[PDB]
């Protein structure tokens, strides 16, 4: 089936500048127009603008035409998004779609992109153990910027999965907890681990949760 | 750029309600509107196009309408896996502008949250602080209180509570509150206690531990 994935989302400097990268998979990306979407944390969706399949024609929404310059690899079957001189408004998920029939049939999970004068923070990972349903879970303490994922067990636990929204601590930066229901029976005879992964940082943990 | 407008920006429903979304636009853009549905955490997925026109896998439930300026969205019956921001959007003139998005929330019965207290890792004991954590799983309405117990008496500290959204299963919400001490203050006291006051509890539940137990 069609997938996008967008890479390189991260910690930019007001006036900074960083590429964006879609990989897709599925399809003839050649055949296809290509476009990216932002959506500020807890906000609406804007449109930022569309490449055709030979590069000939490329449209932006014009508020953000200095912001951005949309380019592909048809060889690569990658879509690129540049960003120029960010500003704090800027801070955005950045979602690439594939537009078909004037619709956006298939989009990308997205990247977050946050413009800030802070500096990058990987994560601390600690086990939340136990002692008929039981909890355990991780706690993934002070990072900067968001986000971090967590799975389960490399993605075979999805069941009971909770996975908090950050806080910003006093500190200035992010924590979360990631938290799993299990059988308590299962306590003694399941191996659990979660899953860290924070792109910014480039930091992969895995934590064995024992109780 | 062609505003479009949704209304209302905001409802709660039950399971099995019929509910209707309205989109507007600055302009006449004939039969050129989508509709998307944004669920939690997700990805905005294409819902109906061209006005009506349901797209490849949408249940039979989801249906749209209109012309010109005016457009609706309608769920025939509400299903809990409806829970989402729905959002409208022009395809008519560039650039495509969307709407500002419809949040849908259900409501459901009340349930009471299921209880979980986790005492600080020996791992993060190691680096100075201790973040104790109480877990409220699975409960309906949102409206909860957690009280930290420090040796049966209320303490002060710094506690921070997230919430997650409703689920798309059982519309519930989970909630966790985490107390963060430093070490040295983590070992002036020995029951760390969480009591939880919700609606489905009758009266309130604490959840325990012995520091070092
Ligand atoms: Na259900």
Redesign the interface.
Known sequence: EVQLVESGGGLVQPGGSLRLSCATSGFDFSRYWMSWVRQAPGKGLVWIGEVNPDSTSINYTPSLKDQFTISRDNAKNTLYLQMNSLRAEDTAVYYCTRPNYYAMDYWGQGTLVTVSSASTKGPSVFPLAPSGTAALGCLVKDYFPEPVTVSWNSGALTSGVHTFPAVLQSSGLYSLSSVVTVPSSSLGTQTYICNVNHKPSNTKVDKRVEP | ?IQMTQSPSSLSASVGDRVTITCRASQDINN?L?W?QQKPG?????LI??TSRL?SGVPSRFSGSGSGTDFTFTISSLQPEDIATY?C?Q??T????????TKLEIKRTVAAP?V?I????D??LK?GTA?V?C?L?NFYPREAKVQWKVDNALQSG?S?????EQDSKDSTY?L?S?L?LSKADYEKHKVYACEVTHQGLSSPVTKS?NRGE
């Open positions: 750029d050129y989508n998307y997700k990805a905005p997925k294409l196009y061209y797209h959002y959007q395809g008519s560039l650039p495509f502008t969307f709407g500002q998005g299921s979980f986790f005492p600080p890792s791992e993060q680096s973040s954590v877990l799983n710094n921070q509570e997230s919430v997650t989970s966790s985490t963060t531990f």
